[PDB]
Every structure is written in C-alpha cells, then in structure tokens.
C-alpha cells in the first residue's frame, strides 16, 4: 500500500492583480483535510480529520497573519515576477488544412484543420466553403495542452468536396494582429 | 490567471515533488537530488529566479505531515486511479520534416508511473524527454512523455505505461 500527502498554495488573480485569492490546501490521500482561504481569513477544516489542525493553527496568531499576508507577500509578488514570460506569452499558431482521407472526386470527407503551437489557449478557428461559414459539421478536439507551453486543436469539417469548390479555415488568435488563413481547393 | 505551488511526498517510495504551475503549465520544478531549480522553459531562468534549497525544506514538512496523517487516518491506503494514456504528435506528420511524439498520461494517482517508448518493439531512449507529475483541479495527476522522431513508414511506436492500479502494462500504439 501507498500513502500520500500533498500541499497546494493557490493565487487566484481576478482581472490582473486587481483582486487576489490565496488558498492553502492540505490533502492527504486524495482527500483535502484543511484549508486557509484568503476570503475567509481563518483556517477551516474541510473534513473532520483536518479539524485538529485548523483548530490549532487558528490559536497561533503568528501563523495566521503569516498566511494572511500571502495575498501580497507571495500571490501578488510572484504574479509581477512572472507576468512577463507567462501572462504576456504569445506564440504563433501554425494552421494546416488537409483531408483525413484520400477520397473520390466526391464522397463523405473530413477536412482536418490542425491549429498548433499557439499560446494562450484562447482562440477561434472557423470553417468556410465558397464563402459560407460551414457551422453544420465541425468536429474539434478542443484545446490540448502539449506540456511544453503550447497548445493545439484539430477542427475537422465533415464535407463531401464537390469537384470545383474551395474550403477555408480562418484562424484568429491573440498572438496575431490579423487572422491566419488556409484555403483548400477540392483536389 | 492562476499560479499554484504544488508539492507532495509519497510515503512508501519516499518520493517527493516541489513545483509551480501557471494555467496548467509548469513554471519549473526543483530537482531534489541536485537541489537545482529545473525551469520548464530555459528562457524562464533568464527572467526570474527561485531558491531550490527552500523546496527541500518544505518537503521535510510534507513528509512530517504525511507520517502524522497516515497514523491519524489509521493507515488507509490511497485508491489507485488508473491513467488515461494518449499518444499524439507535436504537429501534423510530413515525411521530410521531423516530428515529436507526445505520450500524455492523465487522471491518475498515486504519482508513481512507468512510461516507455518502444520503436518497433524495442525501447527508444534515443531522445526521450519528460515532465514531472502535474496537478489538476480534481487533484489527480497529469504527466507528459516525449519522443522526437523522424516520420517514417516502417516504424510503429507505442507508449507503454505502467501503474500500480493497472492490470497489464498498457501500450498505446501509433504509426504513420
């Protein structure tokens, strides 16, 4: 058998550093037991196993303000230290339209539009055919964290390409001053 | 935006971890053995700094709180929640341009894991890269495993992941 203890200090920035919410969570074996919520100001036990702690830590005033100043000492501080390379990170998405199947001149085809590399996650990837915004059959994967600080997303368009029409995937992302687009004329 | 400092100590394996996370992304992690901060991205070290030695200080508190609770909870073992392996690619495959195979493990506990990349059956440490265990709002764990590879037509890769709570070592095949 295994046994795990896991702590978490959390800094919730609402609209920049305007409002912050520090949360000091204590978890044993997937169960959270105690927690210090900035909005509360005092240790509150979530489960009855974590009450002996909140009880004590609350008596100690030194421990209290100690955690209480963390909305500034630690939350707002670290935000401003890292805002540069994180909050202001913008990485160029790479759009690539391609048919998932080498189908006949006209048959049930899925047009994969793979948007990759971007950051932040916020983005728009619209499908169009001859000018009309094909809403009726998109099949996205959604944001997918790649682990290396860049996302990706595959927004397919289930469409039977008529031998004489073009499909366009117009992408819009915060890192770009204009949308990235890829046109795909029927093979 | 949410910045979260996560750390844990797995009692049996005496394994621990200290890390900072921003919107689901590791800012860095302290390498216990070398006492050195290991940034996710090298450019990060250039803009900020963190004192790795404090991490090892903290884990000491975790280990403690761990031994306490383990007893205070009459030695209840953690329920092994199996992982959701998924092999994908850094970007679309094209035969000339080289690509990166990504093996993502998701929703699992305890942190102990055992991933392997097998090229045509035999393991390929030739380029392997990885991350430590990352947190999730439902307090389970994520983890990535990379394998830069050159798009072929004869190689078949499988990401073989092992976990205590997992009958057989699940392999997760991939091929161009």
């Amino acid at each position: 058998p295994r046994f795990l203890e896991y702590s978490t200090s959390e800094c919730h920035f609402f609209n920049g550093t305007e409002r912050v919410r520090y949360l000091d969570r204590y978890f044993h074996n997937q169960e959270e037991n105690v927690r210090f919520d900035s909005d509360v100001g005092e240790f509150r036990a979530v489960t009855e196993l974590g009450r002996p702690d909140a009880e004590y830590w609350n008596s100690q005033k030194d421990l209290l303000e100690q955690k209480r100043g963390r909305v500034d000492n630690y939350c707002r501080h670290n935000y401003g230290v890292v805002e540069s390379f994180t909050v202001q990170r913008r990485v160029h998405p790479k759009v690539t339209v391609y048919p998932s199947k080498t189908q006949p001149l006209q048959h049930h085809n899925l047009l994969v539009c793979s948007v990759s590399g971007f950051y932040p996650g916020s983005i728009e990837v619209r499908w169009f055919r001859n000018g009309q915004e094909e809403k009726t059959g998109v099949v996205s994967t959604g944001l997918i964290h790649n682990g290396d600080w860049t996302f990706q997303t595959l927004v397919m368009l289930e469409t039977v390409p008529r031998s004489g029409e073009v499909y366009t995937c117009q992408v819009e992302h915060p890192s770009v001053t204009s949308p990235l687009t890829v046109e795909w004329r029927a093979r | 935006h949410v910045i979260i400092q996560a750390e844990f100590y797995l009692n049996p394996d005496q394994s621990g971890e200290f890390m900072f996370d921003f919107d689901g992304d590791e800012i860095f992690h302290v390498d216990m053995a070398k006492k050195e901060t290991v940034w996710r991205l090298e450019e990060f070290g250039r803009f900020a700094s963190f004192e790795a030695q404090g991490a090892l200080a903290n884990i000491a508190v975790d280990k403690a709180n761990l031994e306490i609770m383990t007893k205070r909870s009459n030695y209840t073992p953690i329920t092994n929640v199996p992982p959701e392996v998924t092999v994908l690619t850094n970007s679309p495959v094209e035969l000339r341009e080289p690509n990166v195979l990504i093996c993502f493990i998701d929703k699992f506990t305890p942190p102990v894991v055992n991933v392997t990349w097998l090229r045509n059956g035999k393991p390929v440490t030739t380029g392997v890269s990885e991350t430590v265990f990352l947190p999730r709002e439902d307090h389970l764990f994520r983890k990535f495993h990379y394998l830069p590879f050159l798009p072929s037509t004869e190689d078949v890769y499988d990401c073989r992941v092992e976990h205590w709570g997992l009958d057989e070592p699940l392999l997760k095949h991939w091929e161009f």
Partner: peptide, 15 residues
Amino acid sequence: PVSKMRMATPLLMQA
C-alpha cells in the same frame, strides 16, 4: 537584478 519567486510553506500539523 534577477527577480526572485517566493514559496509559501505548509504549516506542520499537530500530533
């Protein structure tokens, strides 16, 4: 001056 990141510390539980 390279900025530094502050770490919070988990309080020790009683026994």
